[PDB]
Ligand binder design. Structure first.
Ligand SMILES: *[C@@H]1O[C@H](CO)[C@@H](O)[C@H](O)[C@H]1NC(C)=O
Lengths: 50, 49
């Protein structure tokens, strides 16, 4: 600010603004399935075959 | 006894009467490899989970 009635009447407003908005989302999904089946039903050769 | 079992058995017996020890003992070893070392006289028909 400034004022006077004799020699020095002025005005000033050196207003400033600095804003910096930074976001950082970071998502990481990971799925991993493994599944295994087994069956048996056995068979032998007869001990007297030719 | 089954048929094949009696066959193998009297075969080893003919080997022993024929005095051929080597072939006889090998035939017995084959028998035990071919018919297992035990005969089952009981099972339990069931299922499990
Ligand atoms: C069988 O083999 C034995 C041993 O070599 C022998 O003493 C015998 O005379 C053979 N024959 C019979 C019929 O046992």
């Amino acid at each position: 600010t400034e004022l006077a009635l004799f020699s020095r009447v002025n005005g000033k407003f050196s207003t400033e603004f600095q804003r910096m908005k930074t976001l950082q989302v970071k998502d990481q999904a990971v799925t991993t399935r493994v599944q295994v089946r087994n069956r048996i039903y056995t068979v032998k050769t007869t001990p007297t075959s030719e | 006894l089954s048929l094949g079992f009696t066959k193998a058995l009297m075969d080893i017996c003919d080997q022993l009467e024929k005095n051929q020890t080597k072939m006889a003992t090998y035939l017995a070893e084959l028998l035990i490899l071919n018919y297992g070392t035990h005969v089952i006289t009981s099972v339990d028909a069931g299922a499990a989970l």
